[PDB]
Amino acid sequence: VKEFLAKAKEDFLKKWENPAQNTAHLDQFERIKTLGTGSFGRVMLVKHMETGNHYAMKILDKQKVVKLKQIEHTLNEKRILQAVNFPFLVKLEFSFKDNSNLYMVMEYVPGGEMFSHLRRIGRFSEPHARFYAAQIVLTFEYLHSLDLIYRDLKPENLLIDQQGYIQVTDFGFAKRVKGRTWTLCGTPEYLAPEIILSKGYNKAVDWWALGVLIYEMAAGYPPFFADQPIQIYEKIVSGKVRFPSHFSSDLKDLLRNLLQVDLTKRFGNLKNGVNDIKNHKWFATTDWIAIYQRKVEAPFIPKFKGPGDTSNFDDYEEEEIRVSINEKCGKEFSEF
């Protein structure tokens, strides 16, 4: 572990300090289909003519990124993504920008979002949830070892690749920080109490999120839900959680510690670090080495009739990609 990290941190640091820029152009890609949309940009399936490879291209509207004050966050996402490298993080292949947009081309995951399979199936068996949680556990140990905080863990951001393993996406809130940070961001159902009460938080918010995920993966629903955000936040800070009758005793115990409103006793942020999680009962059956190598039996293998298949993704209206004749936000995004 420590042997592995050390070297990994050295490869990251090099890239971190000298990020690669403009490694492609729009006209080298064939637009195929929008795979998701929202906030200030969208993600499209795309084909690279030189290699004939398919990629997921995230296009961000520079002007919209500015109206939503996400400039630094956006710079955080690309700089971090171009420098990291782990089996459960989706790979950033190319990045560039034009007059109107920012573009990040990444590896296309035909398998779709965990969210979709999770909602369709209802809930995962514990051995199934454990298999996915373990992968997240290792990704956070990797990330945190690099001083990175993820901040938006959820089924919607986890894709299943061809081997049934998870690929984390969306580094919009990722940030390299040593010490306390205060930015209010994330998704309601997953916000640590620290964030909602806006009291300066650290990596511990990621571990709390892992606790919400495991519960949702196993129960079929979030440990804290309601129609309006405010209602949800009152639940998160109450220090009250209920577990379906089917949750094993170890599973209940693991979650009690993970969903610990007392961030000075919450597993992961303790003296023993990630080992308080990796050496927990519910994980005793987990071969942590095996999982990193991907030699463990994947509980579910998504299906695709071929490369470029988008049946595992919903459909969205297809707007057009427009690049103004004038540069829009040069200075704000010069390092991208």
Partner: peptide, 20 residues
């Protein structure tokens, strides 16, 4: 059942991130 309350709630679709 909670599962029933969840499925009937307006929060079963993709949840948007928040910031400002």
């Amino acid at each position: 059942t909670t599962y029933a309350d969840f499925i009937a709630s307006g929060r079963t679709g993709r949840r948007n991130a928040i910031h400002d």
